[model samples]
Target: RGCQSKTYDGKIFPGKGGEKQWICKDTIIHGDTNGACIPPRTQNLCVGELWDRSNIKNDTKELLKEKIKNAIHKETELLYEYHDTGTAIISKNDKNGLPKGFCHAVQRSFIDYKNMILGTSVNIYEHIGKLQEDIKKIIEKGTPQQSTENVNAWWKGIEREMWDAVRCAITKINKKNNNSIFNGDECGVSPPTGNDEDQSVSWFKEWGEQFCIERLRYEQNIREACTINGKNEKKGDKIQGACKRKCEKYKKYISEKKQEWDKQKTKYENKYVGKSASDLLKENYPECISANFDFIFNDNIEYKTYYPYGDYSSICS
Candidate 1:
């Protein structure tokens, strides 16, 4: 029905086999054929260098920059627009830093049908990273004209593969328990890397030390709030009040602190621009940071196993 409206209004073209294609598709076809007559079946989408580079005529360097920037913008826009729709946003491929793209309305259709939106701007930025990589190859090649044609073909190929992976990931995750919360310890030292001798000097250790210090500080605050160490030590109402207040404060403080940590993490990630973790951590100890880690179990007893070595070993043993 929606396609019919656009077709009747001439906003879309009737293609071979009675399918409606967008005006952008028509424009793409026209651009590719260079005003030559072509069979309907022969028409192809033309996201090529001429369309990108022609924006700046008489200035070759500016034209190259313009083409690269537009390609990056196009890729970024595709991901940004589809961040939360259907299976695209939660896709493991998207999360694992793979590139994805789709034509405009197809992405918008997901948005319209799913009634959802992406949670993070970082996802859009990450797509831009893939875009940059795509364009970089074109800019570095000896023949810009030949490279741009090749880049378009390559870009379309990647977009097709990425969307396929996204579909599979979405299907796989949706098959799991929907109501399950990703509950587990938020922090712990990763397993020892091969270079155990340098572990102490690693950034992981540094961050882990800071985490422990903050954790201990909170624990001490909780303890002080609960204990009646002063002259007004009481056994009944006062003790009860102290314990209640301690619980309340701890909950509130932890919630606020976690939000702060989340913001800091986002900032740290965005600062890296387009670089992958392997590139970002190339010279650092441990060589890589775990992108994410969490445990899921049905029992509260399972959560008790989280700090078995650090907090529990000392107290329980």
Candidate 2:
């Protein structure tokens, strides 16, 4: 005889429908607790083909230690990458901009600092506390304010002290012929040409004039083109229609030019990507390593509930 289904509590449930039909509330020998079987779900796991969870607990711990070690190295490398790139510093001025490569180098240094720090600690809270202390010190000591008459002089003194250490480090690196020693040049990249700057100015002026003239001409043409009705009465309403058509045409033309300009902008951006001042200085800075570590470590890594109730209860892990 076929084996009969039983409730999770071992009570007999005889029907083929209701909760018993799909083993919903009825337990088989190796099913869920209340007869509710959990379904299999897909996941993008990075498990190796040679994984053997049945190994001893010590072996698992060893593997975990190795993983943590690699994570630390990677985190450190990423920090250096950020410093060599200079992604941490904010622009202090808008119109004139900062020195050619200063901000990029600073930004990269910040990121590197972050990445390195995160890798050192396993927990997020500890890493955050360290970051908070470091940032507070940097701001409080380095910041310029109206509280003193010689603020600029004080700031300059701080800057000189800081740069003296940086320069000394760079000298040692340079002595070794390693390009990683940063001396605040263009990192490894060439800066914009004076010719390019001049061309931009001229092009901007031309573009602005062209837009204004086109708008004015379209407005004048609309007024002249609109006609009167059979009674020779004013048909000012037609002015709006004519003006709209002209505006649309002008907009289309501008859009085409805008697309071309955008393409040029992208080309310029690509030309300097890895070779820019930011990338160069950021590559060498240790501070940047810690900053990057913090950003990535703080990011949440999500884990999901694998199954619902008790389907295939024996293989829950």
Candidate 3:
């Protein structure tokens, strides 16, 4: 009934059975001579040399600093644009650490930024440690060209996978976040070496420590959620992302929180357990932080367990 759009826009190309393709918003994101993947233009900004390099002709090292700054802006714009789309941000291989281009900014963009975006201990250290390991090799012996090559291959591959994922997202053929590429690590790439060891287990315990004062906390956890936490959790099919993101939020808050909470615990210990242990906890803790006590607090006998009266270990909602 709606044949307003034609195969080649009312005019045929001068080719026979030329190529099969999938178009998203007038863009041919995925195409094949027959059935092979090709990198599309949409992925240009999302994939390739870190916002720190130039790949075009006469891009002069003379404007190297300008290139770096502008590239950062360009990349940032692309990421922001694709921020919530079905695009999966993934690395091509699983050796860990970043490839050549990203190796340089491990401190801020990769490590600190990852800490900003993902988990510090859970997501940062191991990957960066090995990724930095790769960087050392690259920095000392690798070339700019080789790094760009390594990076484009990595990003382009991710871009290729994201096409269908984006198509699904835009088409709504799949429900929200129902696309497989939602978690790019699952694109068949392996983790960096030693990542599994740091991967650890059971983030439910860490879920106990956090500032539940602001809904923003949960919102961030909900947003920045995961690779390992998602992958390992048996139920993490779609919510795996929230799993990983929330896991990271807990890990960081737990680290800083322990010190502060210990002091607050001492201060509030004798303050008299007024109201529900859950109630008295807004100062000492909060409802969400009591997740560790789920065995008792999460139980139906909530009053006895959470109404600490004068004790907090019995925290419950």
Candidate 4:
């Protein structure tokens, strides 16, 4: 229905089709005059409206589980490759070093998996007993069998067991922590590169300082351009255009400088800052140190396994 009020009088623009567009005096100043153009509802509805409450939570949990599992699998594969390569390197020196090499690989793998995937620091002594047993098994069966494939298979089995143990441990930790096991705020350590907290703080300070410098320079340039154009007088289209071009040039310069700064900053951090932070963390945080059970094996197991008679007999024997 048309309004009877005198203020309602305004010209209507015809639409492309049979639809009509209203350009009322009340709304024309702001260019929103279509009578049918109502304001969008800004209310945020709860997720219950879009999805079944029960299903949504379960779906999210499932998705997160899958993501974690996938990540673990990829890392495990890479770690296995590294273990294989390390074994090959050690084998070139002496066949007797295979057990030592295997033990080292297993410890390293567990340490990495716990740190990277579970985001937890592990005590190697806590898990070293099981690994030592596995190593003993490999030495016994592997030597008598006289087959490298058997030893490799035994090593693979140990790795599988290690992965399972880690997965279970992670699950237990997550359950107890209510999925807060990987608390970024509390852990404050990045992935093997550096102390994330220190690096982050330094980057933030540098970024703010550089940003302020650039922003001040930009404003100074803009002020200079405005002063040259005489700000007291009304600016013509030509003057406005010139000012805009100058502003754009300054903006581009700022953007380019920021990009260059970011690249250089990342390079510097990766090389220098990250290493320093890592060393600092190692000195401070015991957990930051990679798990080492060399003491456990060297002092106890190494002597018992050394046979003075013939070839070093398997501890498994």
What are the clashing pairs of model 4?
none
Q: List the candidates' TM-scores in order.
A: 0.23, 0.18, 0.20, 0.19
Score candidate 3 by lDDT. 0.28
Candidate 3: 10-residue stretch with minimal lDDT: 32-41
Of 1 and 3, the candidate ahead on TM-score is 1
TM-score of 3: 0.20
2 or 4: which has the higher TM-score? 4
Query: After aligning candidate 2 to the native by TM-score, how far in Å is the CA of 181 from where it should be?
Result: 10
Q: In terms of TM-score, which candidate is strongest? A: 1
How much is 222 displaced in model 1, in angstroms? 1.5
Q: Rate the local accuracy (lDDT) of all candidates.
A: 0.30, 0.28, 0.28, 0.31
lDDT string, candidate 4, 17-89, tens digits:
2221211112121121111111000001011211211222223323433433443443333323322333222
lDDT, candidate 4, at 123 = 21
How big is the RMSD of model 1?
A: 22.2
Candidate 2 C-alpha lDDT tens digits along 1-317: 11122221112223232221111112223211111211000001111211213111223323432432333233223322322333211111111122322333332232222222222211122223344233233333545443222332433343333333333333333443353545633222232223222222222222222233333444444444333243221223322454345444544544444433343333333443554322222344422322221221222333112321111111111
What ordering of candidates by lDDT runs from best to worst?
A: 4, 1, 2, 3
Q: What is candidate 1's local distance difference test score?
A: 0.30
lDDT of 4: 0.31
Provide the global lDDT of candidate 2 against the true structure: 0.28
The local lDDT score (0 to 100) that residue 310 gets in candidate 2 is 15
Ranking by TM-score: 1, 3, 4, 2
The best candidate in terms of lDDT: 4
